[PDB]
Amino acid sequence: MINVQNVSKTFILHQQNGVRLPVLNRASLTVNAGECVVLHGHSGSGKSTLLRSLYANYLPDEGQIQIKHGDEWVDLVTAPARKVVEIRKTTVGWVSQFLRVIPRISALEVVMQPLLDTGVPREACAAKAARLLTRLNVPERLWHLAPSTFSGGEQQRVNIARGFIVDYPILLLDEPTASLDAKNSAAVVELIREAKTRGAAIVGIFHDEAVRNDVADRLHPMGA
Amino acid sequence: MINVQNVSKTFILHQQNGVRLPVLNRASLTVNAGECVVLHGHSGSGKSTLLRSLYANYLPDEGQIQIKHGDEWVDLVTAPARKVVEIRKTTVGWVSQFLRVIPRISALEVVMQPLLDTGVPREACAAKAARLLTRLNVPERLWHLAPSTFSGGEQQRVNIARGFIVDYPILLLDEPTASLDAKNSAAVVELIREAKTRGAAIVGIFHDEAVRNDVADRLHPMGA
Amino acid sequence: QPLLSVNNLTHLYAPGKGFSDVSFDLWPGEVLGIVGESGSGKTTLLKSISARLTPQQGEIHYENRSLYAMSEADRRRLLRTEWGVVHQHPLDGLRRQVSAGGNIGERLMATGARHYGDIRATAQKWLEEVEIPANRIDDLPTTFSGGMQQRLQIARNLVTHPKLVFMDEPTGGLDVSVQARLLDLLRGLVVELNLAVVIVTHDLGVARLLADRLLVMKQGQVVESGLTDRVLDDPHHPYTQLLVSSVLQNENL
Amino acid sequence: QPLLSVNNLTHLYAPGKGFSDVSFDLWPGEVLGIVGESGSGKTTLLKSISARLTPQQGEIHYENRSLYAMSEADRRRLLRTEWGVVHQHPLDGLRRQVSAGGNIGERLMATGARHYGDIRATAQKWLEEVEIPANRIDDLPTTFSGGMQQRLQIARNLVTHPKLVFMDEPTGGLDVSVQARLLDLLRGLVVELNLAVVIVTHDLGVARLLADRLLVMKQGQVVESGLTDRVLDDPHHPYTQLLVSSVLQNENL
Ligand SMILES: Nc1ncnc2c1ncn2[C@@H]1O[C@H](COP(=O)(O)OP(=O)(O)OP(=O)(O)O)[C@@H](O)[C@H]1O
Numbered sequence: 001m002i003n004v005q006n007v008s009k010t011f012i013l014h015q016q017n018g019v020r021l022p023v024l025n026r027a028s029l030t031v032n033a034g035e036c037v038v039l040h041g042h043s044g045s046g047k048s049t050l051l052r053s054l055y056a057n058y059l060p061d062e063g064q065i066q067i068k069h070g071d072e073w074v075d076l077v078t079a080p081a082r083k084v085v086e087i088r089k090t091t092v093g094w095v096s097q098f099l100r101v102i103p104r105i106s107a108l109e110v111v112m113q114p115l116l117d118t119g120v121p122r123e124a125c126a127a128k129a130a131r132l133l134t135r136l137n138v139p140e141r142l143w144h145l146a147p148s149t150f151s152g153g154e155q156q157r158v159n160i161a162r163g164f165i166v167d168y169p170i171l172l173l174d175e176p177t178a179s180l181d182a183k184n185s186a187a188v189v190e191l192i193r194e195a196k197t198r199g200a201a202i203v204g205i206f207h208d209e210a211v212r213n214d215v216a217d218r219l220h221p222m223g224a
Numbered sequence: 225m226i227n228v229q230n231v232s233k234t235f236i237l238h239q240q241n242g243v244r245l246p247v248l249n250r251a252s253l254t255v256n257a258g259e260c261v262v263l264h265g266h267s268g269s270g271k272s273t274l275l276r277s278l279y280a281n282y283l284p285d286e287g288q289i290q291i292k293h294g295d296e297w298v299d300l301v302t303a304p305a306r307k308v309v310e311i312r313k314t315t316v317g318w319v320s321q322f323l324r325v326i327p328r329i330s331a332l333e334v335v336m337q338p339l340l341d342t343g344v345p346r347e348a349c350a351a352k353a354a355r356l357l358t359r360l361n362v363p364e365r366l367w368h369l370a371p372s373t374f375s376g377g378e379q380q381r382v383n384i385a386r387g388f389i390v391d392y393p394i395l396l397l398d399e400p401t402a403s404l405d406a407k408n409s410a411a412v413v414e415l416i417r418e419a420k421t422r423g424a425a426i427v428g429i430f431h432d433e434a435v436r437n438d439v440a441d442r443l444h445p446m447g448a
Numbered sequence: 449q450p451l452l453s454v455n456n457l458t459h460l461y462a463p464g465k466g467f468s469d470v471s472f473d474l475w476p477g478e479v480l481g482i483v484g485e486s487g488s489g490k491t492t493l494l495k496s497i498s499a500r501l502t503p504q505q506g507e508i509h510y511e512n513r514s515l516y517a518m519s520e521a522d523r524r525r526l527l528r529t530e531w532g533v534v535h536q537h538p539l540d541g542l543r544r545q546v547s548a549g550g551n552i553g554e555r556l557m558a559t560g561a562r563h564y565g566d567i568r569a570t571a572q573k574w575l576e577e578v579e580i581p582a583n584r585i586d587d588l589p590t591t592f593s594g595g596m597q598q599r600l601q602i603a604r605n606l607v608t609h610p611k612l613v614f615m616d617e618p619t620g621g622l623d624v625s626v627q628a629r630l631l632d633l634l635r636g637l638v639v640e641l642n643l644a645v646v647i648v649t650h651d652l653g654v655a656r657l658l659a660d661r662l663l664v665m666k667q668g669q670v671v672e673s674g675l676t677d678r679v680l681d682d683p684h685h686p687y688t689q690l691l692v693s694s695v696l697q698n699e700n701l
Numbered sequence: 702q703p704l705l706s707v708n709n710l711t712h713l714y715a716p717g718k719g720f721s722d723v724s725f726d727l728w729p730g731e732v733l734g735i736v737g738e739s740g741s742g743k744t745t746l747l748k749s750i751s752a753r754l755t756p757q758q759g760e761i762h763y764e765n766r767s768l769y770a771m772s773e774a775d776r777r778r779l780l781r782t783e784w785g786v787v788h789q790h791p792l793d794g795l796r797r798q799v800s801a802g803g804n805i806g807e808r809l810m811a812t813g814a815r816h817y818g819d820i821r822a823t824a825q826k827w828l829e830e831v832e833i834p835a836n837r838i839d840d841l842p843t844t845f846s847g848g849m850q851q852r853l854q855i856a857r858n859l860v861t862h863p864k865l866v867f868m869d870e871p872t873g874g875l876d877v878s879v880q881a882r883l884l885d886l887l888r889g890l891v892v893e894l895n896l897a898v899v900i901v902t903h904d905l906g907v908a909r910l911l912a913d914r915l916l917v918m919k920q921g922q923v924v925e926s927g928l929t930d931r932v933l934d935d936p937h938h939p940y941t942q943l944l945v946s947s948v949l950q951n952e953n954l
C-alpha cells in the first residue's frame with residue numbers, strides 16, 4: 001500500500017548560482033497490494049526522482065509519502081532516518097541498474113545479506129539465493145566470486161537477485177531489465193509477476209514497451 | 225596515419241579462476257590522413273578494446289600498432305610509457321563518453337588544459353575553448369563552473385570540446401554522440417568533418433546509423 | 449532508548465575551533481558517519497563523545513547515564529571494557545614498546561581473560577582478520593607500516609567485541625583491498641553483534657557503504673544530517689553539495 | 702636523460718620486509734605514482750630514493766650523480782634546497798615547536814630568502830593555497846588537525862618550487878574538496894614548473910588523475926608498471942586486478 005499526496009521536489013544547485021530545477025509538482029499516486037503502477041514519461045520528466053522519493057533517497061520539499069509499514073502508516077517526508085532504515089529493512093525494497101556492495105564479498109553472500117539481516121536462518125537464505133540466481137541464469141561458477149569481477153549483465157542480475165531475496169510488501173524498480181537480454185528480461189518479468197501475485201505493491205520505471213505491457217497494471221503520467 | 229597489424233588481445237581474469245576471454249584476433253586496420261574508419265560490430269565484439277589499444281590504454285598481447293608520431297613510426301605495443309605519454313600529448317587524441325578531470329576546475333579551464341600543456345598562449349587557448357563550447361551550444365553561464373555540477377549532456381559536450389581543443393593528427397572516438405540530441409550530434413559531426421578536412425586520421429565507434437553514414441568513410445568489420 | 453544520546457554538546461578551543469551545539473542519537477546495530485572539512489571539529493567531537501574531552505556545554509548520556517557526571521573510574525572502565533577508540537594517528541592508540549600481540553591482549557585481559565595461550569591465539573586470529581601476518585605478533589608497532597599500525601589499532605579495539613566503537617578515519621593508510629576487508633568485518637560485527645559505530649571519514653564511498661546516517665560538519669557545526677544515501681545523493685546544504693561534487697568519479701569498463 | 706634513475710635498488714630489513722630489485726626512471730614534468738599493499742615497501746622505497754635510507758644493493762643517480770656516493774653534505778643540501786619530502790605522518794615532516802609560518806619559512810630561508818616580511822607573505826599565500834586560513838600562521842602544528850598538518854607539510858615542501866618531490870600518501874586526512882585543490886595545485890606545478898613527483902597513494906582515483914606512470918608493489922617487489930591508465934584499466938598481474946576490483950564504485954545521478 002502506497003499513498004503519495006502532493007509531493008513537489010525542486011533541486012537547488014548551489015554550485016551554480018543556486019539555480020532552481022523543479023522536477024515534481026504536486027505529484028500524486030496510489031498503489032494497492034498486488035497492483036503494479038509504472039511511471040510514464042520522457043527522459044528528465046522526474047520518474048527516477050519520484051521513485052527515489054518513495055525510497056526516501058530524495059526528500060520531497062512538500063507533500064506526503066505514506067507507506068504501510070506493517071499495520072501503521074508512515075510518512076517518509078517526516079519520518080526519522082531510523083524509521084526509514086527499518087522500513088527499508090522490512091517494508092520497502094529497491095532494485096536499480098547499479099549494484100552497490102562491499103567489493104570483496106562473493107555474489108552469493110551479497111544476495112543472501114538482505115535476508116540474513118532479517119534473522120532468517122543461513123541455510124534458508126543460501127537456498128533462496130541459489131534459487132534466485134538460477135532463475136536469472138547466473139552460472140554457478142560465479143556464485144562464490146565477487147560481483148565486481150563479472151560483466152555488466154551478470155552484475156545487474158546479481159543486483160536483481162539481491163533485490164528479490166526479501167519478499168518486500170512494497171517494491172520499487174528502476175530500469176531493472178534495461179541491460180538484460182530477452183531471456184533474462186523474461187525471467188525478471190516472471191519474478192515481478194510472482195511478487196505481484198503474493199501481494200506486493202510495485203512501482204516501476206520501464207522503457208521497453210513489451211516489458212511494461214507484460215508487467216504494468218496501471219500507468220502514471222509523469223508529464224505533470 | 226595508422227597501421228595496425230595482427231593485434232590479438234585475450235583478457236585473463238585471475239579474479240575468477242584465471243579464465244581467458246579472447247577479444248581481438250589478428251585484427252588489422254589502416255587509416256590515412258583525412259580518412260575516417262568506423263569499427264562495425266555487435267556489442268562485445270571488441271570495438272572499444274581495439275580503440276583503447278590504439279590509444280595504448282590496452283596492451284595487445286601480440287601484434288603491432290604503428291602510428292606516425294611527427295615523421296617517425298612508433299609501435300605502441302612496445303613503446304616506452306614516456307613515448308606514449310608524449311604521443312597522447314601531441315599525436316593521438318581521445319574522445320569518449322566519460323569526462324575524467326580534477327573536480328573543482330571550471331569547464332573552460334578543463335577544455336583549455338590540453339592545449340595549454342602544448343605551450344600555446346593562454347589567450348589563444350581561451351578563445352579556442354570558447355569557440356568550441358559555443359559550437360557545441362554550451363551556455364556561457366556554465367563556462368566558469370566545474371563540469372561535475374552539470375548534466376550528463378553538458379558534461380559530455382565539455383568532454384568533446386576538450387577533445388577537439390588540440391588538432392590531433394590522429395583522433396579516436398568512442399560513442400561521442402550517444403547521449404547527445406539531434407542538434408548537438410550534428411555539431412559533433414560537423415566538428416569531425418572539419419577535423420577530417422584538415423588531414424586527421426580518425427577512428428570512430430558509432431551506433432547511430434545517420435551519424436555513421438554522415439561521418440564514416442570506411443567500415444572495419446569487427447566480427448573477426 | 450538510544451545507546452548514546454548527545455544533546456547540545458559544545459567544546460571550543462576558540463571561537464570557531466572545535467564543535468558547537470551538536471546533538472544526535474545512536475542506537476545498537478547502527479553506524480553514524482561523520483564527514484566534513486578537514487579542521488571542522490570531527491576529531492574534537494569524537495573525543496568529547498568518547499569520554500576523552502569534557503564538553504563546555506551539553507550532555508552525553510550512555511545507557512541513560514550522563515557520561516561526564518560519572519566518576520572518572522567509571523569512564524575509564526567503559527573505555528577499557530565497554531568501548532573501543534581508534535585514533536586518527538594509529539600510534540596514539542598503541543603501546544609503542546609492547547608487541548602487537550600484547551597490544552591486542554591488553555584489552556582481552558582487561559575483560560578478564562587470563563589464559564596466555566588463548567589470548568595469543570585470539571590475537572593471531574584477529575591479526576589474520578585484518579590481513580596482518582600472524583608471524584608479526586611479537587614485533588613492535590614501530591616496525592609496522594602506517595596501515596599495519598592502523599589495522600593493529602582496529603584489531604585491538606575490536607577484539608573485546610565492544611558495544612560502541614569510535615573511529616577517526618580508520619581507512620587511512622589502507623589499500624583498497626584491505627579496506628574492503630575491514631568494511632566487511634565492521635558491517636558483519638554491526639549486523640551480528642549489534643555493534644554501534646561512530647566513524648569519521650573523508651572517503652564518501654566508505655561512508656555510503658557503512659554509515660546508516662551521516663553528520664556533515666563545517667567549522668564546528670553540523671550543517672546537514674540524515675540518512676546516508678539522502679545526504680550524499682540529495683544534499684541540501686551548499687557545503688555538502690560541494691563535498692559530493694569533489695568526489696573523484698570512476699568509470700566502468 | 703632522467704632526472705632520477707633507480708637501478709636494482711634493494712633494502713630489506715628482513716627477508717620480505719622492505720623492497721628488492723627496484724628499477725625505474727623519472728623525468729621532469731612527470732608523476733610516478735606508487736600503489737600497492739599496505740606494508741609492501743612503498744615508504745621504505747620512498748625513503749631510499751629520497752636520500753634517507755642507504756640501499757643494500759643498486760644505485761640511484763640524480764642528474765647523473767650517484768645519490769649515495771655523494772657526500773652527506775651534498776645529500777642534505779639537495780634535501781634542503783632541491784628536493785621536497787612529504788612524510789606519511791605529517792608531524793614527522795614538521796617542527797612541532799615552530800609555528801606554521803616558521804615551518805614554511807625555514808625552507809625559503811634555506812634557499813637564501815632573508816626578508817622577513819616577504820617570507821611571511823609567501824607563507825600566508827601558501828597557507829591560502831592549501832586552504833589553511835592565513836590567521837593560523839603563528840599557531841603551532843600541534844594545534845592543527847591531521848589534515849591541516851598534512852597540508853602544512855605539503856606547503857612547506859612545495860614553497861621553494863623544488864625540482865623533485867617525494868610524497869607518502871599526501872591525501873591522507875584530506876576532505877575531497879581540499880584533496881581536489883591539492884591535485885590541481887600539484888598538476889599545475891608539474892606542467893608549468895616541470896616539477897617531478899613520486900607519490901605513494903592508496904587512492905587509485907588520485908593516481909589516475911595525477912600519476913603519469915604507476916608502480917604496483919607487493920611484498921617489496923614491483924609486480925607491474927607502465928602507463929597509469931593501462932595499469933588500472935588493463936591490469937595483467939593478479940594482485941593489480943584484485944586491487945582495482947576492490948575500488949569502491951560510485952554512481953552518477
Ligand atoms: N540529485 C540530483 N541533483 C540535481 N539534479 C537532479 C538530481 N536528480 C535528478 N536531477 C535532475 O532532475 C530532473 C529529473 O531527472 P530524473 O532522473 O528523475 O528523470 P527520468 O528521465 O525520469 O529518470 P530515469 O531515466 O532514471 O527513469 C533531471 O533534470 C535530473 O537532471
Ligand SMILES: Nc1ncnc2c1ncn2[C@@H]1O[C@H](COP(=O)(O)OP(=O)(O)OP(=O)(O)O)[C@@H](O)[C@H]1O
Pocket residue numbers: 151235245247265266267268269270271272273274398429701934935
Ligand atoms: N579491461 C577489461 N577487462 C576485462 N574484460 C574486458 C575489459 N575490456 C573489455 N573486456 C571484455 O572484452 C570484450 C570486449 O568488449 P568491448 O567493450 O570491447 O566491446 P564493444 O561492444 O565493441 O564496446 P563499446 O560498446 O564500448 O564500443 C567484452 O567481453 C568486454 O566485457
Ligand SMILES: Nc1ncnc2c1ncn2[C@@H]1O[C@H](COP(=O)(O)OP(=O)(O)O)[C@@H](O)[C@H]1O
Pocket residue numbers: 461462464465466485486487488489490491492493843844845846847848849
Ligand atoms: N589543542 C588545540 N588547541 C587549539 N586549537 C585546536 C587544538 N586541537 C584542535 N584545534 C583546532 O580545532 C579545530 C578542530 O580540529 P579537529 O576536530 O581535529 O578537526 P578535524 O575535524 O579535521 O579532525 C581545528 O581547526 C584545529 O586547529
Ligand SMILES: Nc1ncnc2c1ncn2[C@@H]1O[C@H](COP(=O)(O)OP(=O)(O)O)[C@@H](O)[C@H]1O
Pocket residue numbers: 590591592593594595596714715717718719738739740741742743744745746
Ligand atoms: N624499522 C623496521 N624494522 C623492521 N621492519 C620494518 C621497519 N620498518 C618497516 N618495516 C617493515 O618493512 C615492510 C615495508 O614497510 P613500508 O615500506 O612502511 O610499507 P608501506 O609500503 O605500507 O609503506 C613492512 O612489512 C614493515 O613491517
Ligand SMILES: [Mg+2]
Pocket residue numbers: 048049954
Ligand atoms: Mg534519471
Ligand SMILES: [Mg+2]
Pocket residue numbers: 272273701
Ligand atoms: Mg565496451
Ligand SMILES: [Mg+2]
Pocket residue numbers: 487490491492536616846847848
Ligand atoms: Mg581529525
Ligand SMILES: [Mg+2]
Pocket residue numbers: 593594595740743744745789869
Ligand atoms: Mg607507507
